[PDB]
Amino acid sequence: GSTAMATTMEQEICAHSMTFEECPKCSALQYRNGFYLLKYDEEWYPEELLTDGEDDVFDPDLDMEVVFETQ
């Protein structure tokens, strides 16, 4: 958090000691669109959200920290 930044961008790294676009909730914002279909992959209907019980637990199928090309 504000280590050696000042140039312009100050979100290149989320407060999670890592890239912002490399986080979940970060990608949950809907910054992806490989297939511009409002989605990419999934197989788990909406429900018990991320502790938000908002009703939407989109299964991160074919889209993880490795399952993004393999299986």
State which of residues 2, 11, 23, 40 lies at the interface with Zn ion (CB under 5 A). Answer: 23
Of the pair 29, 67, the CB lying nearest Zn ion is at: 29
Of the pair 29, 47, the CB lying nearest Zn ion is at: 29
Written as six digits, the tokens of 21 are 């676009």
User: Which residues are registered as beta bridge partners of 18?
Assistant: 14
**Amino acid at position 17, single letter:** S
Work out whether 26 is an interface residue with Zn ion (CB under 5 A): yes
Written as six digits, the tokens of 43 are 């197989």
Q: How many residues belong to the site for Zn ion (CB under 5 A)?
A: 4
Report the interface residues with Zn ion, using CB under 5 A: 14, 20, 23, 26
